[PDB]
Amino acid sequence: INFARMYLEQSDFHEKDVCVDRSSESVTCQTFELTLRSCLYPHIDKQYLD
Amino acid sequence: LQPYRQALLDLEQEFLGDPHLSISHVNYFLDQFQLLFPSVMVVVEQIKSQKIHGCQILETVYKHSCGGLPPVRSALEKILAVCHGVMYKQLSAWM
Known part of the structure; x- marks a missing residue:
């Protein structure tokens, strides 16, 4: 394990997004306040209620 | 104006391509605009x-x-x- 970590695990360390783009469905995208109310506010209200 | 800009860029490229072109060629090409x-x-x-x-x-x-x-x-x-x-x-929002 020690030699693996120092040499082999050292060698094999090739261990090298919210698309908020309205462009796709701008006509279908809710208003910023409407989008907030429908995605965040309902969840916030649910947590508050619980 | 975007199509006009595109036409102007194409004209620039064409004039760069041929040193024998004159302003009359641009005046012809740009007459539509x-x-x-x-x-x-x-x-x-x-x-x-x-x-x-x-x-x-x-x-x-x-x-x-x-x-x-x-x-x-x-x-x-x-x-x-x-x-x-x-x-x-706007009409969608209202309706």
Whole structure:
């Protein structure tokens, strides 16, 4: 394990997004306040209620 | 104006390609925009002078959209389509 970590695990360390783009469905995208109310506010209200 | 910019860039590239081209070639190539632009400029100046606001601007554009120049007609159709898209978005929100 020690030699693996120092040499082999050292060698094999090739261990090298919210698309908020309205462009796709701008006509279908809710208003910023409407989008907030429908995605965040309902969840916030649910947590508050619980 | 984007198509005009594109035409200007293509003209620049073509003139870079051939050192024997003269300004007459540009004047030929740009004549379509030399006819198109004055009417749109007149329309914009009229819009500015009448201070058309909100959807009342759309009505004025429609009146102007009824022009007789086919290229101007097409351009105003594009503009009207954009304005109708905005109107439809507002109408969607209302409905």
